[PDB]
Design a protein around this motif. Sequence first.
Motif, short mmCIF file in Angstrom:
data_model
loop_
_atom_site.label_atom_id
_atom_site.label_comp_id
_atom_site.label_asym_id
_atom_site.label_seq_id
_atom_site.Cartn_x
_atom_site.Cartn_y
_atom_site.Cartn_z
N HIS A 223 43.13 1.27 -76.27
CA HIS A 223 43.88 2.29 -77.05
C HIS A 223 44.87 1.56 -77.98
O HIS A 223 45.70 0.80 -77.45
CB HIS A 223 44.58 3.27 -76.10
N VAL B 295 55.48 15.52 -74.45
CA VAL B 295 54.00 15.38 -74.30
C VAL B 295 53.50 16.36 -73.24
O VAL B 295 52.57 17.12 -73.54
CB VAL B 295 53.61 13.93 -73.94
N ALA C 19 57.87 5.79 -67.50
CA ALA C 19 59.14 5.18 -67.95
C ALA C 19 58.96 4.82 -69.43
O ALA C 19 57.84 4.40 -69.78
CB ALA C 19 59.42 3.99 -67.09
N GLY D 17 58.18 16.36 -70.25
CA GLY D 17 58.68 15.83 -71.53
C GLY D 17 57.97 16.50 -72.68
O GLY D 17 57.15 17.39 -72.43
N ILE E 58 53.68 9.52 -57.17
CA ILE E 58 52.93 10.67 -57.76
C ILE E 58 51.52 10.74 -57.17
O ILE E 58 51.21 11.76 -56.54
CB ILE E 58 52.91 10.57 -59.30
N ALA F 162 53.88 11.63 -66.81
CA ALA F 162 55.07 10.96 -66.27
C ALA F 162 54.97 9.47 -66.57
O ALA F 162 53.86 8.90 -66.51
CB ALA F 162 55.22 11.19 -64.79
N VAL G 164 47.52 10.24 -69.23
CA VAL G 164 48.01 10.29 -70.63
C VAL G 164 49.09 9.22 -70.84
O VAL G 164 49.14 8.65 -71.95
CB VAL G 164 48.51 11.71 -70.96
N1 LIG Z 1 48.92 8.51 -77.33
C1 LIG Z 1 49.35 8.49 -76.06
O1 LIG Z 1 48.54 8.40 -75.10
C2 LIG Z 1 50.85 8.55 -75.82
C3 LIG Z 1 51.32 8.63 -74.52
N2 LIG Z 1 52.62 8.67 -74.23
C4 LIG Z 1 52.94 8.70 -72.81
O2 LIG Z 1 53.39 9.97 -72.38
C5 LIG Z 1 54.33 9.71 -71.34
C6 LIG Z 1 55.48 10.69 -71.37
O3 LIG Z 1 56.14 10.77 -72.63
P1 LIG Z 1 56.90 12.16 -73.00
O4 LIG Z 1 56.51 13.28 -72.02
O5 LIG Z 1 56.61 12.34 -74.47
O6 LIG Z 1 58.50 11.86 -72.85
P2 LIG Z 1 59.29 11.38 -71.51
O7 LIG Z 1 58.97 9.91 -71.33
O8 LIG Z 1 60.73 11.82 -71.66
O9 LIG Z 1 58.68 12.33 -70.34
C7 LIG Z 1 57.89 11.89 -69.23
C8 LIG Z 1 58.44 12.47 -67.95
O10 LIG Z 1 58.10 11.63 -66.84
C9 LIG Z 1 59.03 12.02 -65.84
N3 LIG Z 1 59.01 11.30 -64.52
C10 LIG Z 1 59.53 10.08 -64.23
N4 LIG Z 1 59.33 9.81 -62.90
C11 LIG Z 1 58.69 10.85 -62.32
C12 LIG Z 1 58.17 11.24 -60.96
N5 LIG Z 1 58.32 10.39 -59.92
N6 LIG Z 1 57.55 12.45 -60.76
C13 LIG Z 1 57.39 13.30 -61.80
N7 LIG Z 1 57.83 13.01 -63.05
C14 LIG Z 1 58.48 11.84 -63.39
C15 LIG Z 1 60.37 11.97 -66.59
O11 LIG Z 1 61.49 12.66 -65.99
C16 LIG Z 1 59.97 12.58 -67.93
O12 LIG Z 1 60.42 13.95 -68.08
C17 LIG Z 1 54.89 8.29 -71.42
O13 LIG Z 1 54.78 7.57 -70.18
C18 LIG Z 1 54.03 7.65 -72.46
O14 LIG Z 1 53.53 6.45 -71.87
C19 LIG Z 1 53.58 8.61 -75.18
C20 LIG Z 1 53.25 8.53 -76.53
C21 LIG Z 1 51.85 8.46 -76.98
#
Ligand SMILES: NC(=O)C1=CN([C@@H]2O[C@H](COP(=O)(O)OP(=O)(O)OC[C@H]3O[C@@H](n4cnc5c(N)ncnc54)[C@H](O)[C@@H]3O)[C@@H](O)[C@H]2O)C=CC1
Lengths: 328, 328, 328, 328
Positions: free
Chosen positions: C189, C27, C94, C25, C116, C92, C132
């Motif tokens: 956090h 991130v 939801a 994604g 995972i 990764a 993360v």
């Molecule tokens: N400050 C922080 O620490 C922040 C953290 N996040 C976290 O980052 C994470 C990801 O967000 P983004 O990457 O921005 O967008 P996103 O939520 O679209 O991407 C995360 C990826 O996880 C994948 N995924 C789901 N099930 C999986 C599996 N079994 N194996 C491998 N991959 C799998 C999805 O297909 C997706 O591409 C979120 O869970 C969120 O909690 C988000 C915003 C701020």
Amino acid sequence: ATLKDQLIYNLLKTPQNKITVVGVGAVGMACAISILMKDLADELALVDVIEDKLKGEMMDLQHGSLFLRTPKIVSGKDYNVTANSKLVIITAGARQQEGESRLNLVQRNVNIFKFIIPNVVKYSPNCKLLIVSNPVDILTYVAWKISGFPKNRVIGSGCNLDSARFRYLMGERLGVHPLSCHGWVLGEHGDSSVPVWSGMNVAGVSLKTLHPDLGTDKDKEQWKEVHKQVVESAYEVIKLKGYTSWAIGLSVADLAESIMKNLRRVHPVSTMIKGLYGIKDDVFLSVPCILGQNGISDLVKVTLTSEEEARLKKSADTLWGIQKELQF
Amino acid sequence: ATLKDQLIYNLLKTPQNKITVVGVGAVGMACAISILMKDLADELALVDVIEDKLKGEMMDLQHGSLFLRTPKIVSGKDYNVTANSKLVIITAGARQQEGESRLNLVQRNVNIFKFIIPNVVKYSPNCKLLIVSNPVDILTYVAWKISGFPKNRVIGSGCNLDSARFRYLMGERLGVHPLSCHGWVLGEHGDSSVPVWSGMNVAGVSLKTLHPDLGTDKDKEQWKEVHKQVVESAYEVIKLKGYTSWAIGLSVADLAESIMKNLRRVHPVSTMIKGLYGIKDDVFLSVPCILGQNGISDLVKVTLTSEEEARLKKSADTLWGIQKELQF
Amino acid sequence: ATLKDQLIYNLLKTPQNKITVVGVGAVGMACAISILMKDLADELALVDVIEDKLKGEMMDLQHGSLFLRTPKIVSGKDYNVTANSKLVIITAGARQQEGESRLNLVQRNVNIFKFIIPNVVKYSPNCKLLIVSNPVDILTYVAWKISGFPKNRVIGSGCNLDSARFRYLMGERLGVHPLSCHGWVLGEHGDSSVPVWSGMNVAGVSLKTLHPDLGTDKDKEQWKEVHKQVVESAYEVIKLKGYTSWAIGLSVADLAESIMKNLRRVHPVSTMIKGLYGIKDDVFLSVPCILGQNGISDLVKVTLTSEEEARLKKSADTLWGIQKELQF
Amino acid sequence: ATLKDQLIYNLLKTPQNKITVVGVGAVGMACAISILMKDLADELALVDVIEDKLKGEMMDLQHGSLFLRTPKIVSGKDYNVTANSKLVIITAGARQQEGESRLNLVQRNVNIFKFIIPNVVKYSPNCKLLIVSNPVDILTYVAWKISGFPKNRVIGSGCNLDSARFRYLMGERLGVHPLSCHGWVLGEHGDSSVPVWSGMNVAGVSLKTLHPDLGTDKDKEQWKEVHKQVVESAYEVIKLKGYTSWAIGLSVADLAESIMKNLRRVHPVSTMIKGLYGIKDDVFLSVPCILGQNGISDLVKVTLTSEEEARLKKSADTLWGIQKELQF
Ligand SMILES: NC(=O)C1=CN([C@@H]2O[C@H](COP(=O)(O)OP(=O)(O)OC[C@H]3O[C@@H](n4cnc5c(N)ncnc54)[C@H](O)[C@@H]3O)[C@@H](O)[C@H]2O)C=CC1
Ligand SMILES: O=C(O)c1ccc(CN2C(=O)c3cccc(NC(=O)c4ccc(Cl)s4)c3C2=O)cc1
Ligand SMILES: O=C(O)c1ccc(CN2C(=O)c3cccc(NC(=O)c4ccc(Cl)s4)c3C2=O)cc1
Ligand SMILES: O=C(O)c1ccc(CN2C(=O)c3cccc(NC(=O)c4ccc(Cl)s4)c3C2=O)cc1
Ligand SMILES: O=C(O)c1ccc(CN2C(=O)c3cccc(NC(=O)c4ccc(Cl)s4)c3C2=O)cc1
């Protein structure tokens, strides 16, 4: 048609980050190589009085610099090669002969600076002066007086290296990387320098707070021995090797980086300190300074005990004691 | 409860990139400082025979290294401090005395390497040997024989520096940055070294193609004078300064970077060359080598004229001429 | 004879610094690009479940990496491409759907981590896990439980970014570069995070000492508004752009640098905190940790007021409140 | 007395390396992050028309930049935030709608550049323009005409990335690191681009020389397939991911580094090519250019076969074919 003209169609045809090192002894060249390898300068100028040796150090450095972001590298006895320097590092000086008085040594250094500083200023009037020559707190004062520069553009290597050394031993004792330890050594460079226990911390946890008998004689752990071993370390290098080069080279490169790349980092460097800690004379000592592209932009006002304040005041007296006797 | 234990809760308790420099003369320390400042190593080991001077160079380097990504820095007369080195740089040698024969000098270097190399190998059996000691093409052979290492893990500083110097002047002539110029100096280090005109280009445009009278005597532009000025430059440094340090320091650091960071970059370094250019003897000369974490992984087979091939063949004869007389 | 064999004489034929990013994604890829450009890894492995999108991000990153110290870059739905990773970054997750309960979201994240983490561990059993995914303090706990790793090799992005943000505003207020300011934001956090006023200093001069009404509501200068603006800044990004990528990317790259280059730097990261601040449950919160090549080597025991200690204790309760309801 | 005034005694009070990125789509932001992380700029300015999205990208980038040598980072719909830019990167343009003619798309891009370029020039009259928007060879011409800048200060992303890609596959085939391979892809960006076989070498050993049937159809090894796979690679990214960001980001950062740090490096970039290869029209194509602080300082006159020369000439015709129809 020439080979140049067959190969290259040309469309187009002054340095912005020139550094001069004055003196190409061990220390000068250690400064020079350490500055090259941090790629701080687009032009590097070397100046000393032994002409044949100067040109050899320039050429040897030139040849090595082919394996870096190669700047222009020039040298001469004449200071015209130092024109438009952003930063000029003075390493030139006289070494104290056996049975020569402190005052006599400083006056010989003064008579040298009376040739150097006016020539530096003539050709680079808006430069920052970084003074490395010992004794550094007095020779910074000397360069300030002769240059007529504002106090922000005249800096001494000061206690930058002693503070680094302190923090290393601090680290070894706590089982922590030196860069995770904070703590200054301020005042007169060497021996008389003051470890400032109040402001020594790891991750903002004050050591003074956890162990209030830190600096004192009734200290179970004897942290006084740290500042002692810092000063002994300076001497043990000279006893074993003959001189120190590498340590001051990198300490100066550190200060040059902060100035040349405008990092606004804090260094305990010799600067004009009249006003502070009840000192009324024009003396230079090491207090924490923000170093940037205009030299010392800010001081950090460290709260000192009456003991710490007195030990500085005593150094300021000794230093003015010599400064008032000097002939310009 | 100690201050360490009050401040720090500990959870946990071998270097992977250790470099040893053998010899802490001008060249050794220039290698050492140049390697520190490229942050190539997590451990740096210094070895020489003058014990008090060794420990001083270690301490001075230690103190300066506080302003870098500080590695472990150790020193000793005993080679046990060189254990698990990924790379060992040999700078130790004998300098030729007045009236001493070339053969006699090499045999004294041999007798030194018969103490050094087996001790290096004892403690770092999987290391790469980088030979800087002159005469470098023979002493690389010497280290190869004594070590019993495969030809890939024994490399000589070779023509790395002379080639850099060549490319600088090439650049000055074409009005092009040295790093945008390509061109090798191969064979015996110094004087007998061969500028390879066939493979000299800018952006892949061959200079030979545009100006087919390039290397020759009937060259209107006289490019022969470039290789001449490269060799004179080596001497003019020694005449003016006494010795070369910085230039070989950075040339060696360049080779160390390629090995330690597995860059698989091309350097004209001394390696075992039996098989090529009709040479049947175990001699080392500079040909382009891919340097990586296992030393020389590949050679680049440069096509040479009959002139170029003969000048190498003649060097290989001279070198085997001495090598066959040596007593191991 | 092939062109390869005519040009190259070959002599010779496992990564030491492999990093896996799980999730590609916004991130994930921000982490990946930020890690590439700090040249931290010799192999980079990307893992997600959408196969066509994964391979495109791999190829796009591959093509850009040609302008860096190019590592090996691989990708797959199958975790076998993550073998021998020194560091695995889990992004990764939801995303919360409309009308989905907080508990239900965490359990969906848990059910993902149950696929995972065991696969990551199968193929890289001595790796460090950097979590993360939000909510990060709970999902670090989840990865710790599923992995059976020791607490030192499981780290959460935690308050690393919030602390950076705090120090920026601290700097703006004092007219000091952020990197010359020190001060942590610890605990849960976001929102519930605790600015630790006791340990906020410049050059070791405590701000609490100079202005003892710092953290309080009767603060003339209203430094409470700083920690408020830190939390509002997180939201204003999401409101205006839709999500945060770059900020967490670089915050994670910072943590990866400390681990991969063994810097032993202090980061306020989520780690197992049972034992401290009268907390008896297996919860993770951000306290200052020394990060090195074995993950969290040390904690720094920060002295907290009873207010600060209670605000943490309250977060630990809320977090165990959810953790105890999760089904593994 | 304020906390600022109690802590900091101030002595003192314009950017020299400002970069503007126009457009904060995937490509724009990939450029921006890639430029931040090479620490090229002391000020970074973002400009797009969607105001809420712009401010979010600025803030997210700001927050991440706290883990770098933090520059000033600003954004606005109004071009006054781009004042005194040394370099301006244009990523803005129109994507071809279904059933829209090639000519019509270019004219819509022209009408956009008629708003952008005059505003850029108004506020940064001595800047270098780097054009990334497709189709890049025509839009470079468009920016040149509208700006009235000399040909040296208007550059197109050109075949910089395609050439990198070529060299990767070249490397894979010879078993050589891509950076040890040399070889250009010149002319019209994508599909019509010309692999220049004459100037493809490793260590100056020409591949054409060793295997004279290199570019040809009767090539036993089928090197034609390399340039094919370069162009297919561009598409396979778009098919699998939707768009390319990272690859052009780093390709542009590479070009920005050469300009901003005055590296005088050779890049195959779109520049005004009237005079060369029997081309009499004001068209832009990719030929090797020395990039420095004044943009394109020099061209390298590559000798091309009649096939290569014709394929360029044909592209120059097609491009002037559209350029002559455009309304300014
Ligand atoms: N400050 C922080 O620490 C922040 C953290 N996040 C976290 O980052 C994470 C990801 O967000 P983004 O990457 O921005 O967008 P996103 O939520 O679209 O991407 C995360 C990826 O996880 C994948 N995924 C789901 N099930 C999986 C599996 N079994 N194996 C491998 N991959 C799998 C999805 O297909 C997706 O591409 C979120 O869970 C969120 O909690 C988000 C915003 C701020
Ligand atoms: O005082 C002199 O004699 C002098 C001074 C500067 C120069 C120009 N100059 C550089 O500024 C510079 C920087 C770095 C390297 C460098 N030259 C070389 O490395 C080599 C020159 C000749 C050989 Cl051979 S290598 C040069 C160089 O020749 C020439 C002569
Ligand atoms: O030869 C010895 O007796 C010896 C060898 C290694 C060491 C350990 N060691 C390092 O490995 C190392 C690396 C970099 C710096 C460094 N020490 C310091 O800079 C200082 C030590 C004492 C002061 Cl004061 S500063 C050290 C250091 O002390 C100590 C003594
Ligand atoms: O999963 C796949 O489909 C795959 C993965 C890795 C590889 C090997 N590999 C690298 O590890 C790697 C690192 C960095 C770049 C890179 N490849 C390229 O830049 C290009 C590939 C094809 C062109 Cl054209 S450029 C590669 C690359 O191709 C090949 C196929
Ligand atoms: O367009 C605006 O609204 C704007 C522009 C510049 C600024 C000043 N500025 C920087 O130049 C800059 C560079 C890098 C980071 C950065 N801001 C921050 O790091 C943070 C702001 C708030 C928190 Cl918390 S961190 C800033 C920043 O705030 C503020 C608002």
